[PDB]
From a paper:
Its activity is suppressed by the anti-sigma RsiW under normal growth conditions. The cytoplasmic domain (RsiWcyto) interacts tightly with SigW to inhibit SigW activity. In the structure, RsiWcyto interacts with the groove formed along the surface of two domains in SigW (σW2 and σW4), resulting in the burial of the promoter binding area of SigW.
The residues of two SigW/RsiWcyto complexes in the asymmetric unit (residues 3-95 and 125-187 in SigW and residues 3-72 in RsiW) were traced into the electron density and the final model was refined with R/Rfree values of 21.0/28.7%. Two SigW/RsiWcyto complexes in the asymmetric unit are superimposed with a root-mean-square deviation (rmsd) of 0.7 Å for 224 Cα atoms, indicating that the two complexes have the same conformation. The x-ray emission spectrum measured in the synchrotron facility revealed that the crystal contains zinc ion bound to SigW/RsiWcyto. By contrast, RsiWcyto interacts with SigW by wrapping the surface of SigW, resulting in a large surface burial of 3324 Å2. The surface binding area of SigW/RsiWcyto is divided into three binding motifs of RsiWcyto.
Residue numbers in the entry:
A (entry chain A): 2 to 95, 124 to 187
B (entry chain C): 3 to 72
The structure:
Amino acid sequence: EMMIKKRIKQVKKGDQDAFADIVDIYKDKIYQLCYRMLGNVHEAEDIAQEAFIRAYVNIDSFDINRKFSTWLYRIATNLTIDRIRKKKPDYYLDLELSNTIQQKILKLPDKYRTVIVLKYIDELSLIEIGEILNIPVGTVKTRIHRGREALRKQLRDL
Amino acid sequence: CPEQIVQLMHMHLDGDILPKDEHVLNEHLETCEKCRKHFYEMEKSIALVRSTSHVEAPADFTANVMAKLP
Ligand SMILES: [Zn+2]
């Protein structure tokens, strides 16, 4: 957007208050992404906060010419993927409707869970999902096809 | 049963299907109770995960982020 870039320009030059506008605009989207990846309110608010704090810390690193949301999503996706993997116990060795959906979202491997949440909950394009995950448009299409198939096994009986 | 057909089911759902390929897919679903059922089960599942786009950030989320900043 025009507005957000202008807010970013203020942030870079010393204006910390102008970041609040960036948080308000994206708070609901980012928290929703982490909550539907993790399925737990406490870790969701935590990782959603960390994403915004990390976004501020690294704001000078952000290329002004690219899209900011794509950047911010990448940060949030990498925090939640990392947490999902941490939970897996062997990591360091080497009838309410939407809660039922939610628990079924968590039975998908993180590489299919990500694309399903971004495509079907957050309504992004394949091109933007690729950018966020740093994979070709082809590969994201394939992951969605697999996610839809994994999702079908879980949700058909609801 | 062409093993090709699920690739057609997926191109449809991508919004990507060819006009030619759409007619072929429609013809097979009509004469195949197992490929309607498969395609009906994905559409249902999609519909059900779309009904979970209602999440919003907790109270005072912004205020919490701003205090945590350096
Ligand atoms: Zn068939």
